[PDB]
Amino acid sequence: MRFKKHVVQHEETMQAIAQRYYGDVSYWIDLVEHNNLKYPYLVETDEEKMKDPERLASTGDTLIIPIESDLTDVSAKEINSRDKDVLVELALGRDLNITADEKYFNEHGTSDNILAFSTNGNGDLDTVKGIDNMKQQLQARLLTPRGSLMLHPNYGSDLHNLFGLNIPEQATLIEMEVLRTLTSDNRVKSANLIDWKIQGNVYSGQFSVEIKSVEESINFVLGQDEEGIFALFE
Amino acid sequence: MRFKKHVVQHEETMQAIAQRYYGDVSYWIDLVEHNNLKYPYLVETDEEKMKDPERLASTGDTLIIPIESDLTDVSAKEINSRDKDVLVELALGRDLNITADEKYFNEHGTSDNILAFSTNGNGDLDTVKGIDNMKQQLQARLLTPRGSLMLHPNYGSDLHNLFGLNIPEQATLIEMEVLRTLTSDNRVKSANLIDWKIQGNVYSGQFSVEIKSVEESINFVLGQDEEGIFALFE
Amino acid sequence: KTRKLTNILSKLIDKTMAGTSKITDFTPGSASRSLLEAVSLEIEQFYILTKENIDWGIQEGIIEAFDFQKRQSKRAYGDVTIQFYQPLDMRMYIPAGTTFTSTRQEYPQQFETLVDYYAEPDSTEIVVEVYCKETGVAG
Amino acid sequence: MKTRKLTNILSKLIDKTMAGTSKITDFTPGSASRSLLEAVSLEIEQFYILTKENIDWGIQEGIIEAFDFQ
Amino acid sequence: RPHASIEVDTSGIGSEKVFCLIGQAEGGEPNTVYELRNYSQAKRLFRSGELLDAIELAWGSNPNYTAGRILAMRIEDAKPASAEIGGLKITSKIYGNVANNIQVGLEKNTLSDSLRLRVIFQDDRFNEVYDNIGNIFTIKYKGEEANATFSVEHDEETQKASRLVLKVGDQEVKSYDLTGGAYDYTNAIITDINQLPDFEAKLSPFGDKNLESSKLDKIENANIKDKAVYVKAVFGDLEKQTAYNGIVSFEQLKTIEPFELTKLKGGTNGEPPATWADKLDKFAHEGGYYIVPLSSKQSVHAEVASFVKERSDAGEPMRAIVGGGFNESKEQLFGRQASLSNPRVSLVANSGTFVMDDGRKNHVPAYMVAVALGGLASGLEIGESITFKPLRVSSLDQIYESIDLDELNENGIISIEFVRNRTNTFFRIVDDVTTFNDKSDPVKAEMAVGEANDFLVSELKVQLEDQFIGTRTINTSASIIKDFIQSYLGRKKRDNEIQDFPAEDVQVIVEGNEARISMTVYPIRSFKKISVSLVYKQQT
Amino acid sequence: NEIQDFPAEDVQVIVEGNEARISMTVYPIRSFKKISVSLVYKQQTLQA
Amino acid sequence: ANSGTFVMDDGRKNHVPAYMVAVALGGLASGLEIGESITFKPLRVSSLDQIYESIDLDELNENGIISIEFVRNRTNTFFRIVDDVTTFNDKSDPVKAE
Amino acid sequence: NEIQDFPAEDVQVIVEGNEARISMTVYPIRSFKKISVSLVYKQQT
Amino acid sequence: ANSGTFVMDDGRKNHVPAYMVAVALGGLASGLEIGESITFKPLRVSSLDQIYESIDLDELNENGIISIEFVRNRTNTFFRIVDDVTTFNDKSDPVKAE
């Protein structure tokens, strides 16, 4: 259950509040009955409220409006930028940082024993959030061979076997495998080739990944309020 | 109930009156019976009427023709120009003048405590009628913020929030809001943009408003005769 | 028994029309209709006030004459002492709502001041009044 | 409730209105100001009458309630 | 500061051809023009007389073309009734003998110890009482000392209240010198007197009079401890009593005294002026076009003719319609037409009867018919003719034959012919001819044709003065002038006020201050002969 | 519209030493203080 | 210029001087996009120690002083910022003034 | 919306040794401070 | 030439001499763009001590003296300036005469 709570504004009236929320002034008597107010409902200052603190409310006192509010179906335009940042951070999850020391496992991508945990400098375990989290998860999936992870046959990639000849065919195989691995992530709305080239031994390519938009993540997280899990089991 | 009343014209006959109104001379005996006339129905002058004032009528006396007349379904062409002016004045309503001192609330359009009542110079409250009334009501609606008026959530305009950037987009928003506010009035048949421009800070625009035509207002007011309210609860 | 807002407004408009035909616009946003609506709202609020007073009188008027007081629910309130290390080096200000609490699991009740207070420079300890946030004997 | 009447309320309103401004000096029958003030004072009179009646009804109801004399 | 602004325009919603009347009236001020729109306004202003009947007729002359904004004047040099009693001067608003029967009379009320006024005028069912004259406030004492008194006295140089003193025994508690300070009104005085520990100056229960401090009357040595003594100020309070309601004004030349319910005197209607030149001048710049005097006198007719010619010479064209007598022979009409022989004057021959809204079968002379014709002409559009229009006259004193009508029209005399069984009325106007009998000249002879020309020229003059004179001279000015003229001429064509105009003929030349312009127009006319030929054919 | 018109061609500039000589022509702004208009009436006949 | 009161999340009706309001205005300005104005934005101040009239506000703005005007029954708050003027009173110069 | 507009052709670049001389034109951003609205009324007969 | 009464917004009827009317003409002309003229413009005056006739206005204008006329022909009367002629006498010099 959730309800709206209104702070009494300067020289406000109950009729104005009723019009503002219920869309009709007729509910002011219901608002009085629910809040248990005496006739001078909104006193000028706290000196009048001292006469009867229980049954009177002054400026800056909080009223309760029993309308069943729900955090979904709320216009994203109202939400503050910090609130949107926190919401997308929740949507994209928080995880222990393992992709620290990028150079080392970039020098040995196909091998095992490549990545490890790290500390945040404050004596606690390091953590990657939001975009850093997505980076970590996408790197780990791409780097993991498919079928090597226990309890998860399909998690990973087949790039360890695509060290083939220098022709466009193997390039296309690599590209298709990379697109499959990126599409396997539920959060990745789509992925597509940008450019590639062959320099004899060395292959080079680059991709573009569109994660779910702010609006979708906000809708997902605010829907999750109904359950209260606020966690990701994808 | 309403009936037609005919003034006896010079050397008129009952047969001519019957032909003129009932479209047939046969009703002259009914006209005699209803008006209770003796045989010399339309005497030459009042000297003959002195012989029997009750049962005779002279020139300039008023007869009653019991035909159920109704002020609607009357050709507007017959109505006198003054009568049409009074009818449209009734249609567009009479109200207490508050938009006096145009300069002051034009200098402070967005603020409150901008307009006030005034006197007509004859020790009575000032009143605006017809076009002046429409001007007052349209100015007041445009100037009123939407949702600020008690008992009327939708009355007003959102121009107080449209003090945005200097681009065509905000211009279009202003124009759309103004068209919405003008369309909200029932009497405004339509409104449309004429021209607009931007001079850095200052925005300027002009609109064209077509109020309901003389014919429609005449039909509305003459229909209202059946009820007798002659007032506006729009 | 009592009139209401719509009825008061309608009767006001009818009486105004009957008094004079100089006014005929009674649409929303009209100055005259706004004024009558405001008067109607005030009269409806006075009607509710009279209803409250009569509902109190029905159940408390007669018995009160015989020195019998009905016990109303109240918030526990009292005085508390605040001591300073030294005389104040400037005018201290304690805003309304300043919360006072106890360091025990036996009394999680929270107390707050309902008025502003000022401690003068010369003072060294000042007493203020606090009100329990919860009605009942728990305070 | 002091049992005011319409004429005194209207007279008081008109007197204050005159005292606040010398421009308004037309309070004849059919005038806008007189009609508005008349309507307001009439509603006040009806409020006072009904308040008296409701207080009489409340006294009977409290007599019935206090002693449970159904 | 930043703020929103809003403008509204109304010039697109819309000459008016205002109509004038001068004549005898039983009420209203002399030598004063008024603007009339409603019949109740004229009845309040003009209590009775022929002028009110002419206003009614004009607004009821035709069913479809009644005139508006009729400008009226009273020719009677009347005076208002007045009387004197004690130091008072009594003077009524109404001019004429009607004010003599206004009853005025002062009395005293013993319960309130206050003068009373009662004014009765039974003609209008007026009866009012102004009780509680003076009695502005009550001085009351709540102490237990030996005595307590007050005193207010006048300053003889200005008859203003010199002082206002409260005393306990013999000495003073506090004195308010009313001739100085900020205590100009009694309320400033009472608001500070009530603050004294043991004194009160409660404003009287008989309303909040709020009179000037300097106008308080002379009262000294009265017991406060025993009585709630009244300071009165009867003359200054009579302004509050007669603030808004009251037919009769009052002034003081001295002391006021009660007196009997006495009727006024001196109210005089006055004889009518012999010459209306001074009366007519007041309509110099009123904007009226059609004026009709309510008189059968040939001298007045010549005066009006001179007046309308002078105003037409001053750029304000006007026209007049005249008539008189009951059943005037054709010789008199020809003599009157030969005496006038003016294009801007029209003569009316027939006189008859009209059914007023009040029910009076008013038999009237011929100038009342000329009023009705003027009101119908003014009701018509610019350049529309009064030919064959219905008049709604009940009856006429004569029924002229087809030869008599042809003689009257050939002599430039307007006439009305009986006609049977037409849908509107049993009478119609035969022609809109003027006194000028040069039928070859259509401008001078026909009322409509010249009215079209005069309104066209006046409107062109006013718009050209308003628009371009005083402005700047730039390259676009000439083009703009031509476009404005073309738009005006297309507006006139659209309204059927002209027949047609060639657009190319409009030329504009600009050189320094001057702006030389030229144009051509085909002017408006209304049909006066309609011919129809038929051809019969058969097949075998 | 502070000036009426000016021909650009007339704007000639001579430069010699420390002296600069300029010639120009300008048509001064003017304001209307007289309007003379002539009107002529003509007959017309319409057919069909 | 204006000083008033703020309802803290802790429940304190903190009556504060004018620099706390200047903190709030700064935080709102920094919250806005680059080159967006703090004109007519809501402030959510509970109350103020003064209610300046339309002449007093016009004097303060003509002297290059920021002020807050009471306003009734608006959807967000009962107060708004009238202008984003600076102390430099050369209104002709838009860079320095605004 | 951080500027009103800029003409692309006005942007010039000149390179000579170390220096890089550049020039450009911009129409700067503003937020409205007066909003005006005029109305015209018309009818048909 | 003309002197008249100006109804102040404060409610005082300022029956003032002719140099206050000159102050009003100067305040009108200062707001008008370069090259314009106060001719035929309204003056916003309530009343004037004299209503000059056509002969009087013509004589004042020919003598190089500014006068104001009262227009009653219109539906709504107002006062307008007739010319902006200077005190220099020769009309052959339009620059100095205007």
3-state SS, residue G69 = strand
Distance of alpha carbon E113 from alpha carbon A146, whole angstroms:
116
G35 touches chain H (CB under 8 A): yes
Which candidate from E314, E465, E470 shows the least CB-CB separation from I41? E470
Q: How far is CA B195 from CA A147, B172, B192, in A?
A: 68, 12, 10
Q: How far apart are CA B57 and CA B67, in angstroms?
A: 20
Closest by CA position to E412, among listed E380, E440, E439, E392: E439
- Assign 3-class secondary structure to I54-83: HHHHHHHHHCCCCCEEEECCCCCCEEEECC
CB of E59 closer than 8 Å to CB of E357: no
Dist CA E271 CA E279 (whole Å): 14
Using the Cβ of A189 and the Cβ atoms of chain B, whether some distance falls under 8 Å is answered with no
What's the CA gap between I56 and E54, in Å, rounded?
Answer: 39
* B194/H31 Cβ within 8 A: no
What DSSP character marks residue B144? S
Helix %, strand %, coil % of chain E (to 5): 25, 30, 45
Distance CA C123, CA C120 (A): 5
Nearest-10 Cα torsion for E366, E370, E375, E376: 100
Under DSSP, the state recorded for E202 is: P
Contact E238, E133 (CB under 8 A): yes
Q: In this complex, do D33 and B125 lie within 8 Å of one another by their Cβ atoms?
A: yes
The last residues before gaps in chain B (C-N over 2.5 Å) are none
- Provide the H-helix boundaries in E170-218: 186-193
How far apart CA D3 and CA E177 sit, in angstroms, is 42
Mutate to test the interface with B, among H32, H38, H40 (most CBs of B within 10 A): H32
Chain A contacts of C98, Cβ < 8 Å? none
Q: What is the stated resolution of the deposited model, in angstroms? A: 4.4
Q: Is G9 helix (H, G, I), strand (E, B) or coil?
A: coil
Facing residue for H39 by CB, picked from E3, E5, E8 = E8
B46 touches chain E (CB under 8 A): yes
- DSSP letter for H31, please: B
CB of E285 within 8 Å of a chain I CB? The answer is: yes
- What is the C-alpha separation between I64 and I35, in angstroms, rounded? 19
> For chain C, what's the residue count?
139
Whether the Cβ atoms of residue F41 and residue E521 lie closer than 8 Å to each other: yes
**Could you tell me if A81 and C101 are in contact, meaning their C-beta atoms sit under 8 angstroms apart?**
no
Residue E171: partners with Cβ closer than 8 Å, 6 or more residues away: none
In this structure, the dihedral spanned by the alpha carbons of residues I63, I68, I69 and I70, taken in order and rounded to 10 degrees, is -170
C75 Cβ under 8 Å from any chain D Cβ: no
How far is it, in rounded angstroms, from Cα H31 to Cα C98? 42
β-strand partners of B205: B196, H37
What span, in angstroms and rounded, lies between the C-alpha atoms of E211 and E187? 8
Q: Which residues contact G78 (CB under 8 A, 6 or more apart)?
A: A9, A10, A11, A12, G70, G71, G72
Q: By the 8 A CB rule, do A57 and A14 touch? A: no
Output the six-digit token pair for C91: 């005018």
Q: What letter does residue E264 receive in the DSSP assignment?
A: P
Please give the span between the terminal C-alpha atoms of chain B, in angstroms, as a whole number.
27
- Edge-to-edge strands of the sheet including E229-231? E199-200, E137-141, E229-231
Q: Is B133 exposed, middle or buried (0-12, 13-18, 19+ CB in 10 A)?
A: buried
CB contact under 8 A, B125 and D24: yes
| Cα C61 to Cα C51, D62, E446, distances in angstroms | 14, 7, 93
CA–CA distance, A110 with B156 (Å, rounded to integer): 67
Question: Looking at chain E, which residue has its C-alpha nearest residue D22?
Answer: E243
What angle is formed at CA B10 by the lines to CA B5 and CA B13, rounded to 5 degrees?
A: 70
Q: Is A75 left (phi over 0), alpha (psi -120 to 50) or beta?
A: beta
Residue F11 burial (10 A CB sphere; 0-12, 13-18, 19+): exposed
Does the beta carbon of B103 lie under 8 angstroms from any beta carbon of chain E? Answer: no
Residue with tokens 């110099």: E284
Q: Do C25 and B141 touch (CB under 8 A)?
A: no
User: Beta strands E3-9 and H34-42: pairing type?
Assistant: parallel
Q: How far, in Å, CA of I1 to CA of B156, rounded?
A: 51
Six token digits for residue E474: 């730039």
**CB-CB: which of B96, B123, B127 is closest to D25?**
B123
Residues with Cβ within 8 Å of G82's Cβ and at least 6 positions away in sequence, in order, are E1, E2, G39, G40, G57, G61, G66, G67, G68, G69
Assign 3-state DSSP to chain H and report helix, strand, coil percentages, each to 5. Answer: 0, 50, 50
Q: Whole-angstrom Cα distance, residue G24 to residue G43?
A: 8
- Comparing alpha-carbon positions, the chain C residue that sits nearest to G14 is C95
* Residues G65, G27 contacting (CB under 8 angstroms): no
Please indicate if any CB of chain G lies within 8 Å of the CB of H11: no
Q: Which of I12, E25, I14, B210 is nearest to I4 (CA)?
A: I14
Q: Identify the H or E element spanning B113.
A: none
Percentage helix, strand, coil for chain I under 3-state DSSP, each rounded to 5: 30, 20, 55
Chain-chain contact of I33 with F29 (C-beta, under 8 angstroms):
no
Please check whether residue F36 is in contact with residue E514, taking contact to mean a CB–CB distance below 8 angstroms. yes
Where helices occur in E425-499 by DSSP H, the ranges are 442-445, 447-468, 475-494
Residue E530 contacts D, CB cutoff 8 Å: no
DSSP states of C47-105 as a string?
Answer: HHHHHHHHHHHHHHHHHHTTT-------EEEEEEEEE-SSS-SS-EEE-BT-EE--SSS
**Residue among G8, G11, G15 whose CB faces C112 most closely:** G11
Q: Are G30 and G45 in contact (CB under 8 A)?
A: no
Name the nearest CA neighbour of E277 among E295, E294, E299, E292.
E299
Q: Of A107, A123, E323, nearest to A115 (Cα)?
A: A107
d(CA E333, CA C99): 108
B229 sits in which H/E element: none
Q: Are A189 and A212 in contact (CB under 8 A)?
A: yes
Nearest-angstrom CA–CA distance, E207 and E133 = 11
The DSSP line for D35-50 is: HHHHHHHHHHHHHHHH
In sequence order, the β-bridge partners of residue E126 are E121
Chain B residues whose CB is inside 8 A of the A25 CB are 150-151
- Residue B79 near residue B214, CB atoms below 8 Å: no
I36/E469 Cβ within 8 A: no
Cα–Cα distance between A149 and A158 in angstroms, integer? Answer: 13
Q: Which residues of G touch H2 (CB under 8 A)?
A: 33-35
Residue with tokens 């110069």, as numbered in its chain: G93
E203 SS3 class: strand
Whole-angstrom distance, CA of residue E165 vs CA of residue E177: 8
As a 3-state breakdown, chain B gives helix, strand, coil percent values, each rounded to 5, of: 40, 20, 40
Nearest residue to E398 (alpha-carbon basis) of E372, E424, E421, E416: E416
In 3D, which of E278, E353, E279, E360 has the Cα closest to residue E20? E279
**CB burial class (10 A; 0-12, 13-18, 19+) of residue E59?**
buried
Taking CB atoms and an 8 Å limit, are D25 and E244 in contact across chains?
yes
B/e letters for I63-74, b = 16+ CB within 10 Å, e = fewer, are eebbbbbbeeee
Q: How many CB atoms lie within 10 A of CB E94?
A: 24
Residue E428 near residue E384 (C-beta atoms within 8 A): no
> Nearest 5 degrees, angle CA F33-CA F37-CA F42?
175
| Chain G meets chain H (3+ C-beta pairs below 8 A) | yes
Contact (CB, 8 A) for E330 and E409: no
Q: How many cross-chain Cβ pairs, C to D, lie less than 8 Å apart?
A: 74
Task: Kindly state the DSSP code that residue B119 receives in the 8-state scheme.
Answer: B
Query: Would you tell me how many other CB atoms lie within 10 Å of the CB of residue E130?
Result: 18
Q: Which helix (H) or strand (E) holds H37?
A: strand H34-42
**Residue E16: which residues within 8 A CB-CB, separation 6 or more?**
E68, E69, I75
Maximal C-alpha separation, chain I:
46
Computed over its alpha carbons, how large is the radius of gyration of chain E? 35
E480 touches chain F (CB under 8 A): no
Q: How far apart are CA E142 and CA E140, in angstroms?
A: 7
Measured at the CA of B48, the angle between CA B45 and CA B52, to 5 degrees, comes to 130
- Inter-chain CB proximity H37 and E7 less than 8 Å: yes
The secondary structure of C11-46 as a DSSP string is HHHHHHHHH-SS--B--TT-HHHHHHHHHHHHHHHH
Closest CA to E319 of E430, E435, E457, E416: E435
Let me know how long chain G is: 98
Amino acid at E250: F
How was this structure determined? It was done by cryo-EM
In a 3-state reduction of DSSP, which class is residue E175?
A: strand
Tokens representing residue E420 in the block: 């049977």
Alpha carbons B45 and I28: distance in angstroms, whole number: 71
B75 secondary structure, DSSP code:
-
Chain B touching partners, 3 or more CB pairs below 8 A:
A, C, D, E, G, H
Task: Starting at the earlier edge strand, list the strands of the sheet with E361-363.
Answer: E361-363, E352-355, E395-396
B/F touch flag: 3 or more CB pairs below 8 Å: no
CB proximity H31 to G under 8 Å:
yes
Question: Do residue G14 and residue C99 have CB atoms under 8 angstroms apart?
Answer: no
What does the block give as tokens for H33?
Answer: 């401070």
Q: What is the number of helices (H) and of strands (E) in chain A?
A: 8, 6
G76 phi, psi to nearest 5 deg: -85, -70
Phi, then psi, of A46 in degrees rounded to 5: -70, -15
Q: Is G48 helix (H, G, I), strand (E, B) or coil?
A: strand
For tokens 């007339």, the residue is F10
Q: For the beta carbon of residue E158, count every other beta carbon within 10 angstroms.
A: 10
How many residues are present in chain I? 98
The residue to which tokens 């916003």 are assigned: I44
Nearest to E68 by CA among E38, E45, E25, E48: E38
Helix then strand count (H, E) for chain E reads 12, 29
CA–CA distance, E35 with E328 (Å, rounded to integer): 34
Q: Quick check: E149 and E223 in contact, CB under 8 A?
A: yes
Please indicate if any CB of chain B lies within 8 Å of the CB of A19. yes
Length of chain A in terms of residues written: 234
Measured at the CA of E206, the angle between CA E202 and CA E209, to 5 degrees, comes to: 75
B80 near B14, Cβ under 8 Å?
no
Rounded to an integer, what distance in angstroms lies between the CA atom of residue I1 and that of residue I22? 9
**Could you tell me the two tokens for E4?**
């929103």
